[PDB]
Design a protein around this ligand. Structure first.
Ligand code: HEM
Ligand SMILES: CC(C)(C)OC(=O)N[C@H](CSCCC(=O)NCc1cccnc1)Cc1ccccc1
Length: 459
């Protein structure tokens, strides 16, 4: 018939698909590894099939600019359909075509230089609570789980910035806001579920009517009333122009359409920030020279363990180098994807309506062809002297083009703002429980398989 015939017929190379599964079984080593191997084997372009769905992997920087930038609105506007979303259909990251265009520009005003600057003092409160929590754990001497302390900070930041609600999470070890969020996705291919959709996608519209989800009305009802609650607050006291505010501004934004974005943003700013800071501390711990060289810049730009400011945060060139370099090793997203909504030729390559075009970020970031010593943590590769030798289309930890990460500037600041405080008070040391080297899990979340547990000493 067809479907599986597509890449042989187009003469694009790739792994031979099995009936029904496609190349699904090759995800056994995780898909970054699968991607790494494909790159090595097939070169600049290749195809494969998630079940019956053709995916075209592309690695040329030109071709990548075309799909992410030059042809975003015209052909490549949406990501692959998600799996049973429900009312989350309207969440910006899941929305398509014109629905997305109106939400993008209704929400993009949230992350503007001035807005972040107003979040600066707000975080400079949750900064202090991170340390005072850590200082109690520097007493014992025995091992700290970064994901836990950092996850509780990030929660605090997002709930407070976007919403104006101080939920005190750092002075609340037991908290439902964080414990429901972390259980929002079990994206796992060893788990039959997301596996039994990206191979049984015909079963997606089956699940819509069954009202079943990727967070089964367990997490979403918490926030369906918890964000219904933060919503009344503003509608009552005749303050600040934030996320929760600028969504109240538009009320053509509806009600479950407001919640949906909140849920995105609550999740997004909890799981990323915390996963990346965990990665940064792992690298700083296992590279003490780099940890110090940074403690030095922080001390130089901010003497007497001074309170970080917006302006000073952008001064710290080595910090940014450290962050970018961790994000080179751990692009938390792994791949960027854009469904091709009409037949198209790009940079001299035919691509048929319906195909998913995929940019393997994790592979590009590790390309032995492009990066000298690509598995080594080498912050110096992002120096003024070297930074420009770096292709914004090979290095893409935040995606690119109109559909790139709405949360980028906030994330970078948020992270930098925590790191500053954390390092201007403590040093981090590997202990016996620390996994050296760090190995990644095989799920669809770029994560360490053992949590990063380190040692904390005062200064
Ligand atoms: C280190 C932290 C973060 C990283 C590495 C990251 C990375 C990414 C990537 C790679 C994408 C896809 C963009 C594309 O494919 O072109 C993305 C999209 C997105 N990110 Fe993030 N992100 C981070 C933090 C955040 C935060 C804190 C928020 C919350 C404000 C956020 C909200 C989003 C949204 C809403 C999208 C979808 C954008 C759209 O389709 O309009 N991200 N992010
Ligand atoms: C809908 C829900 C909030 C449950 O989650 C997602 O949006 N689904 C995607 C799965 S990846 C999980 C998070 C991660 O490790 N990295 C990516 C990320 C998440 C949020 C914001 N920025 C980056 C998440 C997703 C969202 C946008 C683009 C691609 C993936």
């Amino acid at each position: 018939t067809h479907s599986h015939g597509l890449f042989k017929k187009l003469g694009i190379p790739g792994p031979t698909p099995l009936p029904f599964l496609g190349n699904i079984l090759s995800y056994h080593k995780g898909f970054c590894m699968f991607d790494m191997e494909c790159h090595k084997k097939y070169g600049k372009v290749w195809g494969f099939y998630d079940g019956q769905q053709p995916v075209l992997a592309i690695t040329d920087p030109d071709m990548i600019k075309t799909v992410l930038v030059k042809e975003c609105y015209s052909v490549f506007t949406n990501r692959r359909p998600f799996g049973p979303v429900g009312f989350m259909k309207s969440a910006i990251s899941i929305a398509e075509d014109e629905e997305w265009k109106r939400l993008r520009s209704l929400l993009s005003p949230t992350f503007t230089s001035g807005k972040l600057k107003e979040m600066v003092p707000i975080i400079a409160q949750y900064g202090d609570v991170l340390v005072r929590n850590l200082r109690r754990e520097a007493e014992t001497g025995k091992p700290v789980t970064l994901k836990d302390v950092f996850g509780a900070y990030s929660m605090d930041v997002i709930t407070s910035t976007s919403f104006g609600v101080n939920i005190d999470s750092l002075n609340n070890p037991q908290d439902p806001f964080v414990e429901n969020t972390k259980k929002l996705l079990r994206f796992d291919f060893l788990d039959p579920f997301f596996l039994s959709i990206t191979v049984f996608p015909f079963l997606i519209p089956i699940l819509e009517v069954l009202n079943i989800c990727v967070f089964p009305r367990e997490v979403t009802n918490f926030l369906r009333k918890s964000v219904k609650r933060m919503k009344e607050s503003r509608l009552e006291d005749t303050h600040r122009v934030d996320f929760l505010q600028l969504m109240i501004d538009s009320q053509a934004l509806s009600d479950l359409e407001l919640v949906a974005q909140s849920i995105i943003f609550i999740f997004a700013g909890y799981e990323t920030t915390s996963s990346v800071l965990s990665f940064i501390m792992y690298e700083l711990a296992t590279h003490p020279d780099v940890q110090q060289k940074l403690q030095e810049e922080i001390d130089a730009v901010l003497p007497n363990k001074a309170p970080p400011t917006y302006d000073t945060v952008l001064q710290m060139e080595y910090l940014d180098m450290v962050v970018n370099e961790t994000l080179r090793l751990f692009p938390i997203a792994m791949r960027l994807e854009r469904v091709c909504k009409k037949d198209v030729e790009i940079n001299g390559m035919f691509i048929p309506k319906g195909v998913v075009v995929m940019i393997p970020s994790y592979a590009l970031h590790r390309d032995p062809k492009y990066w000298t010593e690509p598995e080594k943590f080498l912050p110096e590769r992002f120096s003024k002297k070297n930074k420009d030798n770096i292709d914004p289309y090979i290095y893409t930890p935040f995606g690119s083009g109109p559909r790139n990460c709405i949360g980028m500037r906030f994330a970078l600041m948020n992270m930098k703002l925590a790191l500053i405080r954390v390092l201007q008070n403590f040093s981090f040391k590997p202990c016996k429980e620390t996994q050296i080297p760090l190995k990644l899990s095989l799920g669809g979340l770029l994560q360490p398989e053992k949590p990063v547990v380190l040692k904390v000493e005062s200064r």
